[PDB]
């Protein structure tokens, strides 16, 4: 996978709290 | 240019309006695009869009193709007022098989991948042989009357007829499906060449002008009724009452009086040229509300392919029959003929449709192909062949090169 | 010849066989490791942090 | 302000316009945010994406939405249309195949 790839999924997870 | 505004197609049907940034790489913009579309929909009340097992969201033109997820919205050949649509395509990862033994991996193979015969086409086949065995039967039995006057020729045929039309009537009534539809069509339009020769073989004497009259005649008249009745298979109906009813102008012309058939050739052409003006007008005359709009649109669509057909084959046969290697001013139907050729050529561009340009396009070629075959069959000589072959390639050769170039 | 063509048919029952549980297996592994591309769409359902 | 100064520092152009506007905030669809409202009353959390713009007085937005099945217009594209290029050096072909 490529870094932008990488960043779009990390926001999409970053959204998420316990 | 900062800025692109295009319509986005969801779920189920909405349409959207949005403004789009023009330089940002798509897939930046397919996340949050998708949440827009997902709080109007429940604002509105409808099921939001959701994913299915393993898969992704894109974004396609409306043809499916997906844009690459990399480049810019400029990048592509995106303009502002376009549309696009948003989709879930699903995960195409799977086990691959494999089979050693090569004879049961050959037939599971090939078993796969092409269709195999059934009792749906075995009737097609057989209802497409006896069409073209009557067809064949009504040739000989007219190439005797050609040669004898007798009733043998319209006795015969009578009662093929009756009986070729008689089954048709059971198919008809009796059929529930498409399929069965088909057949039926095909074995009704074998009826009209044993009923038309029947009549026509019908008058003593030798064959000529006055037999002519009789038997385009019931050819158009047995095409015009069938056609409404029947309601389908429009154009090739159309086209033969088309051909049918002018052959039976000039045939009771030549029957009654004609100075020359030079005349007549002269006078058919002048009506097909005016005619293809006509057509698009007699066309669309001859035509829960969407249903009658797309209805009323498709049956207008056929009548002019049928209607330009028609007229088609009258011109080039007309045309090669003016033409004459012999007669007077050679010349002058050599040009004429030229430009006559350059209307069709030039007016195929004013309609969409491909079958009728191309129709259009084709019937040009046609006709300078026929004359200069013309004028090398008679008045044959090294020089005749020799420059006809000549033109023959060089007339196609430069005009797709002028086209693809 | 008919001894030999009752041997190739009964390989090809076992061979049958094989393969489903070959796709039992396939249905299974896929459904706890997806491909890294995938992963993303997921986020939402409940196989996150599973 | 530091916007314009971190594209500096990439060697980037700063965001500059021309007319009668003012500079916000805007979603992927264009629609601005509100100027005078918390982005904890409005619906942010931590990971969206959001555009800076220029919005001139000029500006106008449809803002209305239509049903038609997707599944039907997609079809609709390729069922009939015009002429192609590629469909004509196919003719072209054939004709000069024709004639010779």
Redesign the interface.
Known sequence: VSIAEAEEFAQKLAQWRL | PQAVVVGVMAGEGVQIGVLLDANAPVSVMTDPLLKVVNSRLRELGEAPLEATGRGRWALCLVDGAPLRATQSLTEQDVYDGDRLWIRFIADTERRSQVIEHISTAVASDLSKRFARIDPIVAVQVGASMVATGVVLATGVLGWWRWHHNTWLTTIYTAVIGVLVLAVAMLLLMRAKTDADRRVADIMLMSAIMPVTVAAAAAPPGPVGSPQAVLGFGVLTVAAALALRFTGRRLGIYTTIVIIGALTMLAALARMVAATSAVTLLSSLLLICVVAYHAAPALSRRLASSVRDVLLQAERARSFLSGLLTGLGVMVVVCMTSLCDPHTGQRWLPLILAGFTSGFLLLRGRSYVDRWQSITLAGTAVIIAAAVCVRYALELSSPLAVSIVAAILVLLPAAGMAAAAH | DAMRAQF?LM??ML?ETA?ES??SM?ANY?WFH????????????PR?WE
Not at chain 3, 34 to 45: D, F, I, R, Y
């Open positions: 190739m390989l090809d061979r393969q070959a796709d396939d896929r997806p491909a890294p591309n995938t992963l993303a769409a997921a986020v939402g359902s996150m």
